[PDB]
Amino acid sequence: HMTTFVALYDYESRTETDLSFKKGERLQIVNNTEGDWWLAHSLSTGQTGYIPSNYVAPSDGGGLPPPLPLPLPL
Amino acid sequence: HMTTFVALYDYESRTETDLSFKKGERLQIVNNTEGDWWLAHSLSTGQTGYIPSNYVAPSDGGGLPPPLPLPLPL
Ligand SMILES: [Zn+2]
Ligand SMILES: [Zn+2]
């Protein structure tokens, strides 16, 4: 199905390559091989640019868990 | 106010000191200064132990953002 992310906070663009967005906006991630800045496309504003990946979460639950942090506790 | 986290996924205990929980449980964090495993207390099961911090989210929205990922886009 169409897989999107939702913004957890507002972000104000400050460069010519980042993307502003509002809390609750739905974003399509067009690229995530760049590190912790992801190339996103807004479903509601039609703008495109880089976003901080820690400002968004997946739009749907039922995702599978991430790897556990290592080391494990005792 | 009472600050809690919510489980995003089930977690099955596998060590001597970790804590099992179910998706949707609310957890009170009693120590989060030791690394990415946090000492938690279940509101519903009354159990206590270490949880993987990437399996939980804050219960409340409207917390403040994390600092912007390190390097930048220009
Ligand atoms: Zn799909
Ligand atoms: Zn409070």
Residue numbers in the entry:
A (entry chain B), B (entry chain A): 85 to 158
Mind quoting what the paper says about this structure?
ChoKα is upregulated in many tumor types, including breast, lung, colorectal, and prostate cancers. Co-precipitation assays and surface plasmon resonance studies offer strong evidence that ChoKα interacts with c-Src through its SH3 domain, and that other domains of Src may enhance this interaction.
We also solved the X-ray crystal structure of a c-Src SH3 domain-ChoKα fusion peptide encompassing residues 60–69 of the ChoKα proline-rich region. Each fusion protein was expressed and purified, and the His-SUMO tag was cleaved to yield pure protein. Of the three proteins, only the Src-SH3(84–137)-ChoKα(60–69) fusion protein formed crystals and was subsequently used for structure determination. Though SH3 domains function as monomers in solution, the SH3-ChoKα(60–69) fusion protein crystallized as a dimer. The ChoKα-derived peptide of protomer A bound to the c-Src SH3 domain of protomer B and vice versa. Notably, peptide residues corresponding to ChoKα Pro61 and Pro62 make direct contacts with the c-Src-SH3 domain, with their backbone carbonyl groups interacting with the side chains of Asn 138 and Tyr139. Another important interaction occurs between Trp121 and the backbone carbonyls of both Pro64 and Pro66. Our crystal structure shows that Arg103 of protomer A from an adjacent unit cell helps stabilize the protomer B/peptide A interaction by forming a salt bridge with the carbonyl backbone of Leu67.
